[PDB]
């Protein structure tokens, strides 16, 4: 999850010839749904990618303090300076082909989370066992091979 | 580590914070509609220490 | 833009 | 540090004193709270 | 397998709207008076300016599967300029002696008013159009 | 479990990775989400019990759903997105592409599709090779707004013989919809055919969105500077035309409503100016927005989106409310103390003047979050009643 | 802050000065003016909800304090500070959230329960939550390999030490529609 | 835990062969070659160069599942013509390409200093 | 100069002296 | 919680996926889950030569 | 933790870049932004790689054993 | 020459600027893929841990190992272990190295590449060598040590690709790009006010004539020119990693044909 409560889990791990580039030769680390931005209204995180994409760029800890000056219009001033779509956009080649992408895709660094839920951990299957002494019922629980 | 917190048999233990109603204090309040009452002066009297 | 740091630098050069 | 910063207002109910209050202000977060049963009733401190 | 429909029309209007490569094109046929036009070109193919002169011609030929036409030379009736391929799709009696018939070039619609070609244009699928200048 | 929906009968696929993996389209019926979702699996022990759920309770025979007489199954997102951009007037297919496309739907014939241009360069419309997936017998016909049979918008929809005459594909056509391309293909050809359908529309559509792509930046929510200028003037001239009311009822002139208070009468007037204004406002910054704009583009297609959330982060939040009434006094005549007494102005009640790109101040930062909260609760104890309310 | 009308010059600006700020700026660089320090001084007061009732605060202490005898389109819409009666002065709004929504970066501009629900993910978090954490014996720990500090951070992060224990990496995140997966 | 063993991306399994050959039922002269411990890398380029070729009638290539490498190729061509011929001329067009586009490299390698 | 008016960054010169003194945990200790 | 409901044997459950390469009816079971979950296949002529294969 | 051997994204070995982004800045007084760039961190993907890495080692390795 | 034709711009020991002209893009693209991907490196794959004193975690190290990156200049004379006759591993197949470190000195003790010994006999080629690019000369650093703070391991370098784990990627970020004015129409640019002014204009914009408005749209135009920028780790030079690229490449097309000419055995 990116800390504006836009959790998921993984769908597909890909490599960096399978990954869509930017014609500078990178790759991201992470592909996120354009989907799930205008039912939530998480402004704030497209802002920070922005921020944090101008950070990196001119080696600073970017400033995303709540009531300040900062515009979103002051930050895409700067990204322009570093010479990117000022908005964020990079145009894209899609990995399968080298083809370009008709759409620029919002590209930059975002804070990412790992949260302490993993896969291998939830996974459970069960196909008789363990069944209680009083009702005679499967048990309940991964750990007790639970029905 | 900021501490505000025990150790108790080994683990770490956190003493959360309870909330209540002031003592002392004289509050009025409109009763329901179909009491008897139409309202009270209620106060929660105790001794501070 | 971003956060001010160059104060171990700006307040021992001032002061 | 959020933990040691915890509040628990005990009722029991679904009411008033779950909403974020005006007095609320600088002294308890306006954002932190869990959903469900504890929504408004633990708070946080600022 | 010959032509049904051919007629020389003036382009009185042209319209992008929304649409950056198709432009809905409005013109008169300059020797029947009766006869109007309607149609949706792809002008970053074949470009139309107002005022233009175009023939318009509307084949039967020249199930089957599309070859690419890797064949050096071959028979088409290929002395136009931009030609289409769609579906009839609606036969409207305007009034006594008037008609208009419904074109799909796969979305690109057309509208070609008359009167006279009855034993000419048909409910066909098989409907190329052709034009030159 | 609150549907006959919530469980259904699937073919097992074996495959490697830990996850349960199922098809998007099934996404809606079960009310999943991949946000840590997790489900069940039950396997029947007797031939008896698979011939249950083989023949009673499978996928393909839940597609329309007795609840609502529509299908409870339609196009969904990357799907919905894509195919409204592959079914335009403007979205032709140069012959690699077409081929790897045909090639990509299982139940193809071989036979490749006469290009709707041929002379300048063999091109194809989305329209016709999405029609591959479309199979024959299928005929639809809708009308919208001003849609005459030489559609002019490419408005409405008309598909002949399963071949696409006219009309973008979005939620209306190829949705969850009661006279859905969805709705017809199975009561038409068998849930059997629909369930193909699903899966052959999405192998095009994906592809080609795969190729095309699609993204969203914050200069989707940045709205062109007069119209910005537009929309402060609009919240401006509300925000005078609601002091012209406070200062007319602070002279006793203003007449009460029938059966409504001086006070129950001057909130309804201003609650509405306010709220007329954010409405307004809002509708200003959806028409500056282009056709490319990536927000519109998912709200077209009916994919995610809604015009509020437009207006709420290009142009205006707007007036927040507690129990039906804007922020009140909690405090002795005021919301918050860097107020004074008395003050019933939109700022004061808890109007957010801003959008959410533009940033919200600290006085309309809590008071969101007054109202935001009153959601919550609100959410937290309507699951538990109709909790209640299914069982008995 | 406490406001007074104090100084005869002009209007009623705040007790504290750019002096207490270099004092306390002093102490500062040298790791005697602390905190106490602003208190006793009397610039400084301690005041909950009861008697909140009978004060009045400014937000900013410049952006409300002057009078008026151009504006930037991009930024926010505030109100003003037309009061000539101001008791006290807020230190910064931000200091209105509690932990973990100071983590949120620019939280202003995000719809209000989304901020609520980040508040309680930043639990479900990974990282290094102690330096000691090869020396403690707990029943289950997670430690990030390679933690990063965040590229946008808040004022408020620099005290609750969050660039020293992070809880993440800085992901190159691309927002794009691809396979579907 | 469940997931598959990383070489198994290029390494052949038991009793699987490089290339299987079917023929297309759905069409006259057409094949479909099902290329296993394969990708893009390859399938893209043969479809390409396919394509290149005057008697190639179609020529497409799709990867089914993205957890498997593998591909099928989808080749059919003008009568008289077997398309494994196709993608057999195809393939050495590729090579001569790439032997001319390795020498030009190595002889613009050779004419740098730095 | 020396006894000039506030900015509004000089608000956090304030807030470092308090967290400088108080900590994070403030209450729980003081209790 | 007894009657009405009960645990279960031959149930399985995980995290879910998207996937569009699935077919709409089909789900894609994990190799691990599918190795526990089992089916009581009766031996009959048509089957015994691929169950004693499954067996082997 | 310690100085990540190469950038995730591309793959650039960063590793060896630590002790002399370090120097850069104290010794040579450079800013964070020149000193990445003298150091030849091209694209930000590597940029943030070193930028924003703390060194944790360094603090786990002042506990005695 | 013949055919597809390179224009080198920029050369160096770490970076490769060209210019690929007469191809398909399809081609340039494979290539690209190849380069990262399926180009074989040596890095370290089996670490056995004598003794670890180190705050740092036995498979933390063990990770960083395999990132570090080994010559392999003269790769094609060392076999992939899977193919290798012995009982898992030896000479002809595998490089042994061997890391000792000790926090002999009261400061911090640190561990880099160049304390790394090669134990394996090396047949004279010019393989496993830890790669140092730092004016320093200590290469990457592993980890840091106290007092008492001993490392004790050895390491089993193979033969390996990308497919397989990224540490054996004998390329960085290739940089690829065709057509700067968009004549092709392959994008339809993103605006607010205008196209042009909006979106940077690309270096390789001097290297191709601009459009001039009174032009139409060339729909009989290809994608051919592209302008690319390999990087190398260190692993295998520049140069090679472009030539490699092409070679093996080649023998995948290659493997089809001679695949295909066994199928014409039955
Ligand atoms: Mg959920
Ligand atoms: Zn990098
Ligand atoms: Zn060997």
Redesign the interface.
């Known amino acids: 999850?990116?800390?504006?409560?836009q959790?998921?889990?993984?769908?597909?791990t890909?490599?960096?010839?399978?990954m869509?580039?930017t014609?500078?030769?990178?790759?991201?680390?992470?592909?996120?749904?354009?989907?799930?931005?205008?039912?939530?209204?998480?402004?704030?995180?497209?802002?920070?990618?922005?921020?944090?994409?101008?950070?990196?760029?001119?080696?600073?800890?970017?400033?995303?303090?709540?009531?300040t000056?900062?515009?979103?219009?002051?930050?895409?001033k700067?990204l322009?300076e570093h010479?990117?779509?000022?908005?964020?956009?990079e145009?894209?080649?899609?990995?399968?082909?080298?083809?370009?992408?008709?759409?620029?895709?919002?590209?930059?660094?975002?804070?990412?989370?790992?949260?302490?839920?993993m896969?291998?951990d939830?996974?459970?299957?069960?196909?008789?066992?363990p069944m209680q002494v009083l009702?005679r019922?499967?048990?309940?629980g991964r750990s007790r091979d639970?029905? | 580590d900021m501490g505000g917190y025990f150790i108790i048999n080994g683990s770490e233990k956190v003493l959360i914070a309870q909330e209540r109603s002031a003592g002392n204090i004289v509050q009025v309040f409109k009763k329901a509609a179909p009491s008897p009452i139409s309202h009270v002066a209620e106060i929660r009297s105790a001794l501070e220490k | 833009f971003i956060k001010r740091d160059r104060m171990r630098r700006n307040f021992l050069r001032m002061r | 540090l959020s933990h040691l910063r915890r509040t628990n207002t005990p009722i029991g109910k679904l009411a008033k004193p779950r909403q974020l209050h005006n007095t609320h202000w600088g002294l308890v977060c306006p954002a932190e709270t869990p959903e469900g049963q504890a929504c408004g009733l633990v708070k946080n401190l600022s | 397998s010959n032509t049904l429909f051919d007629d020389i029309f003036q382009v009185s209007e042209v319209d992008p709207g929304r649409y950056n490569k198709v432009c809905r094109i409005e013109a008169a046929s300059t020797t029947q008076d009766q006869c109007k036009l309607t149609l949706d070109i792809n002008v970053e193919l074949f470009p139309v300016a107002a005022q233009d002169s175009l023939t318009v011609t509307i084949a039967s030929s020249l199930t089957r599967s599309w070859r690419p036409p890797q064949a050096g030379d071959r028979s088409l009736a290929d002395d136009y300029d931009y030609v289409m391929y769609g579906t009839a799709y609606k036969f409207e009696e305007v009034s006594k002696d008037l008609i208009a018939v419904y074109y799909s070039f796969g979305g690109l619609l057309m509208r070609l008013e008359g009167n006279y070609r009855n034993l000419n244009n048909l409910k066909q699928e098989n409907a190329y159009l052709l034009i030159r200048r | 479990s609150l549907h006959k929906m919530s469980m259904m009968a699937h073919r097992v696929k074996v495959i490697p990775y830990s996850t349960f993996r199922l098809n998007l389209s099934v996404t809606s019926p079960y009310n999943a989400d991949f946000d840590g979702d997790e489900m069940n699996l039950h396997v029947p022990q007797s031939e008896e019990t698979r011939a249950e759920l083989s023949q009673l309770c499978a996928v393909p025979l839940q597609i329309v759903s007795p609840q609502s007489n529509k299908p409870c199954m339609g196009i969904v997102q990357d799907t919905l997105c894509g195919i409204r951009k592959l079914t335009l007037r403007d979205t032709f297919i140069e012959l690699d592409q077409v081929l790897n496309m045909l090639y990509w739907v299982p139940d193809w014939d071989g036979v490749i599709p006469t290009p709707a241009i041929i002379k300048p360069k063999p091109l194809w419309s989305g329209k016709q090779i999405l029609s591959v997936a479309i199979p024959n017998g299928i005929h639809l016909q809708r009308f919208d707004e001003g849609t005459t049979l030489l559609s002019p918008k490419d408005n409405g929809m008309l598909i002949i013989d399963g071949q696409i005459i006219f009309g973008v594909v979005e939620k209306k056509t190829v949705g969850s919809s009661n006279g859905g391309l969805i709705h017809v293909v199975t009561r038409e050809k068998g849930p059997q055919v629909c369930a193909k359908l699903f899966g052959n529309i999405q192998k095009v559509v994906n592809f080609w969105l795969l190729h095309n792509g699609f993204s969203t930046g914050i200069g989707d929510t940045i709205a062109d500077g007069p119209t910005m200028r537009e929309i402060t003037e609009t919240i401006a001239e509300a925000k005078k035309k609601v002091l012209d009311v406070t200062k007319e009822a602070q002279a006793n002139l203003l007449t009460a409503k029938h059966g409504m208070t001086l006070r129950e009468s001057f909130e309804d007037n201003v609650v509405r100016f306010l709220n007329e204004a954010r409405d307004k406002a809002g509708r200003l910054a959806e028409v500056n927005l282009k056709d490319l704009n990536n927000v519109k583009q998912m709200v077209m297609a009916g994919s995610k989106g809604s015009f509020i959330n437009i207006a709420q982060m290009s142009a205006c939040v707007g007036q927040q409310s507690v129990e039906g009434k804007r922020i009140a006094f909690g405090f002795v005549d005021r919301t918050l103390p860097h107020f004074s007494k008395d003050d019933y102005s939109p700022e004061s009640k808890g109007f957010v003047e801003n959008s959410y790109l533009r940033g919200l101040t600290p006085q309309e930062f809590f008071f969101h979050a007054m109202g935001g909260r009153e959601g919550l609760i609100d959410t937290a104890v309507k699951t538990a009643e109709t909790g209640y309310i299914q069982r008995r | 802050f406490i406001v007074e009308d104090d100084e005869s010059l002009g209007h009623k600006e705040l007790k504290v000065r750019k002096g207490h700020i270099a004092k306390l700026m002093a102490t500062e660089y040298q790791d005697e003016y602390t905190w106490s320090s602003l208190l006793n001084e009397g610039l400084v007061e301690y005041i909950d909800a009861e008697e909140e009732e009978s004060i009045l605060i400014a937000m900013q202490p410049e952006d409300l304090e002057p009078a008026e005898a151009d504006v930037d389109p991009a930024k926010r819409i505030r109100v003003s500070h037309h009061a000539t009666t101001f008791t006290h002065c807020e230190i910064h709004p931000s200091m209105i959230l509690g932990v973990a929504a100071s983590i949120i970066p620019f939280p202003d501009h995000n719809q209000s329960p989304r901020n609520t629900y980040q508040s309680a993910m930043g639990k479900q978090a990974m990282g290094v939550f102690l330096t000691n954490y090869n020396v403690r014996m707990d029943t289950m720990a997670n430690i990030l390999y390679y933690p990063q500090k965040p590229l946008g951070t808040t004022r408020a992060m620099e005290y609750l030490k969050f660039r020293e224990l992070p809880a993440g990496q800085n992901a190159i995140v691309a927002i794009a529609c691809y396979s579907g997966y | 835990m469940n997931a598959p063993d990383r070489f198994e991306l290029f390494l052949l399994g038991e009793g699987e062969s490089k290339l299987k050959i079917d023929p297309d039922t759905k069409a006259p002269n057409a094949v479909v070659i099902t290329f296993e411990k394969e990708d893009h890398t390859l399938g893209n380029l043969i479809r390409a160069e396919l394509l290149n070729d005057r008697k190639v009638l179609f020529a497409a290539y799709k990867v089914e599942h993205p957890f498997f490498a593998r591909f099928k190729l989808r080749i059919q061509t003008t009568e008289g013509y077997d398309p494994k011929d196709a993608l057999k001329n195809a393939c050495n067009s590729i090579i001569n390409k790439l032997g001319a586009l390795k020498t030009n490299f190595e002889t613009e390698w050779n004419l740098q200093t730095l | 100069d020396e006894s000039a008016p506030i900015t509004a960054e000089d608000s956090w010169a304030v807030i470092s002296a308090f967290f400088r003194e108080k900590g994070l945990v403030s209450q729980q200790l003081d209790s | 919680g007894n009657l009405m409901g009960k645990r279960v044997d031959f149930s399985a459950r995980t995290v879910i996926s998207g996937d569009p390469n699935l077919e709409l009816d089909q789900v894609g079971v994990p190799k691990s889950i599918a190795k526990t979950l089992t089916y009581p296949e009766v031996v009959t002529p048509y089957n015994i030569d691929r169950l004693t294969q499954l067996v082997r | 933790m310690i100085v990540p051997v190469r950038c995730f994204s591309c793959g650039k070995v960063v590793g060896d870049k630590w002790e002399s982004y370090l120097n850069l800045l104290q010794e040579d007084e450079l800013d964070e932004g020149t000193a990445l760039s003298r150091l030849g961190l091209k694209r930000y993907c590597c940029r943030r790689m070193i930028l924003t890495h703390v060194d944790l080692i360094e603090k786990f390795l002042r506990y005695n054993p | 020459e013949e055919g597809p034709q390179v224009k080198i711009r920029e050369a160096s020991k770490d970076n490769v600027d060209f210019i690929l002209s007469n191809v398909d893009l399809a081609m340039a693209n494979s290539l690209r893929r190849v380069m990262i991907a399926e180009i074989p490196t040596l890095a370290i794959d089996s670490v056995e841990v004598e003794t670890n004193t180190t705050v740092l975690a036995d498979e933390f190290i063990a990770h960083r190992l395999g990132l570090i990156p080994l010559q392999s200049m003269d790769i094609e004379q060392l076999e992939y272990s899977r193919d290798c006759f012995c009982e898992d591993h030896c000479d002809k197949c595998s490089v042994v190295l061997t890391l000792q470190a000790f926090g002999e000195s009261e400061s911090t003790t640190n561990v880099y590449s160049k304390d790394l010994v090669i134990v394996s006999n090396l047949m004279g080629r010019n393989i496993g060598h830890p790669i140092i690019q730092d004016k320093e000369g200590n290469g990457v650093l592993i980890c840091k040590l106290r007092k008492g703070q001993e490392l004790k391991l050895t390491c089993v370098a193979k033969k390996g690709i990308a497919k397989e784990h990224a540490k054996w990627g004998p390329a960085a970020a290739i940089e690829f790009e065709y057509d700067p004015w968009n004549k092709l129409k392959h994008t339809d640019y993103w605006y607010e006010q205008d196209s042009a002014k909006e979106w940077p204009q690309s270096k390789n914009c001097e290297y191709e004539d601009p459009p001039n408005e009174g032009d139409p749209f060339d729909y009989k135009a290809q994608a051919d020119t592209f302008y690319m920028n390999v990087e190398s780790v260190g692993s295998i030079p520049v140069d090679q990693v472009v030539v490699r690229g092409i070679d093996t490449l080649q023998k995948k097309v290659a493997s089809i044909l001679l695949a295909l000419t066994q199928m014409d055995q039955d």
Request: glycine share 12%.
């Open positions: 999850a990116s800390r504006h409560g959790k998921g889990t993984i769908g597909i890909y490599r960096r010839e399978d869509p580039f014609a500078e030769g990178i790759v991201p680390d992470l592909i996120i749904n354009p989907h799930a931005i205008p039912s939530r209204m998480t402004v704030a995180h497209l802002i920070e990618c922005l921020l944090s994409k101008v950070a990196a760029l001119s080696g600073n800890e970017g400033d995303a303090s709540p009531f000056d900062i515009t979103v219009e002051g930050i895409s700067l322009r010479g990117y779509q000022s908005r964020g956009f145009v894209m080649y899609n990995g399968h082909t080298g083809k370009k992408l008709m759409a620029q895709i919002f590209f930059g660094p975002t804070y990412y989370q790992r949260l302490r839920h896969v291998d939830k996974i459970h299957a069960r196909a008789r066992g009702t019922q499967p048990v309940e639970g029905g």
